[PDB]
Amino acid sequence: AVSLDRTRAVFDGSEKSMTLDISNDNKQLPYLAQAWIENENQEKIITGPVIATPPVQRLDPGAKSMVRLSTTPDISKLPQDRESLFYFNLREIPPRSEQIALQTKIKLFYRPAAIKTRPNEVWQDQLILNKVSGGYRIENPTPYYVTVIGLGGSEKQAEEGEFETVMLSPRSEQTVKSANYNTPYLSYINDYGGRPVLSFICNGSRCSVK
């Protein structure tokens, strides 16, 4: 019944807080919306650096409320030259007229003000594919988390084709499995949940974006 307004979020480090919209799609019954944060290791954290409030709230049939995320002063102890990962969790509680199942678990990227991004900015095009045996060794030089959900020999394939999603941490690299493609097409997930497609060009084993 209770749902979120997005499948992922980014926290603007230059702000003290932000908000996420929730709703009770059930127009005949009241539900409870429980929310909480977890660190990158998916462990629950009650007092900072990122807070989610209110922990619990009631939403009458068809209600449309929201949950607020804010930071504590300790948020400054996190690196300011790279994104930090957190998880936002939402669980619903039906009428007591009636197991820890969730409504949705989305990633929450803390983006320090230092590396703030301008609207519609692309940085995922800085990924470097390195041909290897069995696939590629993708490199992420950017200070952000880059999630790759597609990789094919053509654009339509990087979208329709099946791929083992992988999330590269800031300034890191990982090796994925793939067939050797003449002109590799990468597909990633942006901040709003979009699936843009990048066209790459190789030169030996090192492939880069056009």
Ligand X SMILES: O=C(O)[C@@H]1CSc2c(C3CC3)c(Cc3cccc4ccccc34)c(CN3CCOCC3)c(=O)n21
Q: What residues contact 120, with CB distance under 8 A and at least 6 apart?
A: none
Report CA-CA distances (Å) from 38 to 33, 60, 66, 74, 178. Answer: 17, 27, 18, 16, 32
Piece of 39-47, 65-73, 91-99, 201-209 that binds ligand X (CB under 6 A): 91-99
Whole-angstrom distance, CA of residue 74 vs CA of residue 147: 27
Q: What is the DSSP letter of 169?
A: P
48 binds, among its own copies, ligand X, none (CB under 5 to 8 A by kind): none
Whole-angstrom distance, CA of residue 203 vs CA of residue 143: 25
Piece of 51-59, 74-82, 118-126, 165-173 that binds ligand X (CB under 6 A): 51-59
60: contact with ligand X by CB under 6 A: no
66: contact with ligand X by CB under 6 A: no
Residue number with CB closer to its own copies (75 or 151): 151
56: contact with its own copies by CB under 8 A: no
Residue with tokens 């209110």: 54
Piece of 12-20, 45-53, 65-73, 99-107 that binds its own copies (CB under 8 A): 99-107
Residue number with CB closer to its own copies (70 or 191): 191
58 binds, among its own copies, ligand X, none (CB under 5 to 8 A by kind): ligand X
32: contact with ligand X by CB under 6 A: yes
Report CA-CA distances (Å) from 28 to 22, 63, 101. Answer: 17, 11, 22
Whole-angstrom distance, CA of residue 128 vs CA of residue 172: 11
126: contact with its own copies by CB under 8 A: no
Q: Give the one residue of 48, 135, 141, 161 binding its own copies; rule: CB under 8 A.
A: 161
165: contact with its own copies by CB under 8 A: yes
Whole-angstrom distance, CA of residue 183 vs CA of residue 106: 32
Whole-angstrom distance, CA of residue 104 vs CA of residue 62: 19
Interface with its own copies by CB under 8 A: which residues? Answer: 3-4, 7-8, 91-92, 100-106, 147, 149, 152-154, 156-157, 160-165, 167, 179-182, 189, 193, 195, 202
